[PDB]
Amino acid sequence: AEAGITGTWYNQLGSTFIVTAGADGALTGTYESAVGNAESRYVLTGRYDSAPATDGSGTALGWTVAWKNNYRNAHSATTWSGQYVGGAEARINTQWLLTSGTTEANAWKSTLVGHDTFTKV
Amino acid sequence: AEAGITGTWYNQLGSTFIVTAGADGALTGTYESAVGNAESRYVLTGRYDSAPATDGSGTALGWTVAWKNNYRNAHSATTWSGQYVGGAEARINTQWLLTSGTTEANAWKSTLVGHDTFTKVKP
Amino acid sequence: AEAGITGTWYNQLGSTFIVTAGADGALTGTYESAVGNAESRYVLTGRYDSAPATDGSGTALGWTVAWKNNYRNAHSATTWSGQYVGGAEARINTQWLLTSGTTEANAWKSTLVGHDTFTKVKP
Amino acid sequence: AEAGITGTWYNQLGSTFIVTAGADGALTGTYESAVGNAESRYVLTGRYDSAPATDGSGTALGWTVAWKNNYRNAHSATTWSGQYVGGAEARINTQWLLTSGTTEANAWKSTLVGHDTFTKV
Numbered sequence: 001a002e003a004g005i006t007g008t009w010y011n012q013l014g015s016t017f018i019v020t021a022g023a024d025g026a027l028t029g030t031y032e033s034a035v036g037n038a039e040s041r042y043v044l045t046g047r048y049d050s051a052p053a054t055d056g057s058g059t060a061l062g063w064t065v066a067w068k069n070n071y072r073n074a075h076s077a078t079t080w081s082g083q084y085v086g087g088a089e090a091r092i093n094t095q096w097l098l099t100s101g102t103t104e105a106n107a108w109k110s111t112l113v114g115h116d117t118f119t120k121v
Numbered sequence: 122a123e124a125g126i127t128g129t130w131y132n133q134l135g136s137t138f139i140v141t142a143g144a145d146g147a148l149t150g151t152y153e154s155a156v157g158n159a160e161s162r163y164v165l166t167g168r169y170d171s172a173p174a175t176d177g178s179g180t181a182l183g184w185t186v187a188w189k190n191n192y193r194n195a196h197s198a199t200t201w202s203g204q205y206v207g208g209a210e211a212r213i214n215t216q217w218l219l220t221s222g223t224t225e226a227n228a229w230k231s232t233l234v235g236h237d238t239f240t241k242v243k244p
Numbered sequence: 245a246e247a248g249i250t251g252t253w254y255n256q257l258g259s260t261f262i263v264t265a266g267a268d269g270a271l272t273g274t275y276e277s278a279v280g281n282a283e284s285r286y287v288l289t290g291r292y293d294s295a296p297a298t299d300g301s302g303t304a305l306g307w308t309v310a311w312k313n314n315y316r317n318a319h320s321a322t323t324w325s326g327q328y329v330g331g332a333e334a335r336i337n338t339q340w341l342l343t344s345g346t347t348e349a350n351a352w353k354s355t356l357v358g359h360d361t362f363t364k365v366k367p
Numbered sequence: 368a369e370a371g372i373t374g375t376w377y378n379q380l381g382s383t384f385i386v387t388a389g390a391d392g393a394l395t396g397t398y399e400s401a402v403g404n405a406e407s408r409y410v411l412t413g414r415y416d417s418a419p420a421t422d423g424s425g426t427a428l429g430w431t432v433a434w435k436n437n438y439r440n441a442h443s444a445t446t447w448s449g450q451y452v453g454g455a456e457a458r459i460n461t462q463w464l465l466t467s468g469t470t471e472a473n474a475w476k477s478t479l480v481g482h483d484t485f486t487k488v
Contacts (some may be wrong), residue, residue, distance in 0.1 A: 025164070056224050063200070064168045075178070077202060101178045290412065294433075296442060301470055306433070310392050
């Protein structure tokens with residue numbers, strides 16, 4: 001729990017997430033995707049439960065990446081919600097929402113949903 | 122535009138969202154929920170597209186609130202993903218995910234999904 | 245109650261849902277979408293809780309529409325999950341998932357999520 | 368594509384899905400869960416694209432199970448949306464929504480979301 005969130009994590013697609021978990025609940029770092037109209041690292045900011053469990057529970061957290069950096073602007077943002085589980089093999093299990101900025105007409109189809117599992121391997 | 126988003130907003134459940142959009146695409150503020158095992162304000166951080174498109178397209182954004190403050194700890198976090206639409210009645214239309222910390226056993230039922238629409242009142 | 249649900253319903257996009265709730269918990273009917281690469285009516289099948297609770301609780305249900313008929317084939321399917329609420333203004337509030345068939349490569353972006361509310365007009 | 372959907376599939380949790388895919392798009396069978404206020408088989412009905420791909424694509428399908436049978440009535444329903452991929456190892460990849468019948472007050476928290484992968488192993 002706590003500390004263990006800090007580090008470099010990779011998801012199945014090969015995207016890399018580098019985060020720092022602050023003692024009070026903050027999450028900061030950068031994200032490099034393997035898919036999308038992405039190119040390079042993007043800033044990410046989030047929050048986690050800095051006082052999780054004491055039943056054998058994971059630590060809830062979530063973070064956002066707006067897909068705009070100095071090289072690309074996909075006009076979209078992704079949010080990941082999930083929980084961290086530490087152990088010999090620690091992982092972050094998430095479900096995400098990716099919303100693109102659309103005109104009203106296309107608003108009905110602006111959000112994609114998926115899931116990603118991140119490991120430090 | 123950072124400004125347009127900056128302000129106080131309320132959603133249909135009666136929750137309060139106080140946000141400041143910064144020049145670099147950052148979002149910070151506090152959230153007061155009308156529902157849940159929540160009590161008082163919680164800190165929120167997010168990001169938005171500071172350079173949207175020059176048409177009548179919304180501005181994509183998202184933010185997170187971990188439901189822990191000095192009064193309560195719900196051991197859960199919510200992320201909202203959606204878009205800001207300006208005009209006379211500016212709105213933020215979102216879809217959210219609420220994940221609770223759980224044992225490996227109940228992980229299958231750790232996440233709730235819903236949608237919220239916010240109406241702006243103040244800057 | 246099977247009846248309450250049986251009827252013609254429309255959602256905020258202007259789509260039509262014609263459904264019959266059968267005694268065993270089955271749902272069958274046709275759906276006419278106002279959006280997408282859809283054209284005409286499509287067959288729908290679903291299930292609902294034929295024995296809900298005896299309080300002011302909604303009736304959970306869900307249905308699917310594969311977007312293929314004799315005129316079009318969009319290679320995608322949508323499932324709606326939500327609840328039926330009776331009264332004078334009966335509504336079906338739902339959240340939906342629209343999955344498109346894709347190559348392994350773009351599978352990450354195969355599913356869209358949204359919400360729809362239906363208002364009843366006819367039985 | 369087509370035919371291959373018919374069979375017994377199992378998901379990570381150990382739930383078993385037995386389906387029959389009809390030549391015209393129908394899906395019928397039963398579902399036995401490993402989790403939830405479940406007990407036994409429940410009927411399921413769905414639809415699939417009976418004319419998928421010809422790029423190497425999966426077959427979109429979806430189905431519903433209302434959690435009521437002769438033994439239990441959880442007053443909930445689950446819908447799975449996803450696509451089928453055949454091959455030496457065929458699988459059905461899904462994201463699901465589980466809605467419980469609530470009073471209005473609790474409507475905001477009536478739906479759970481997750482994902483499941485099914486194999487014939």
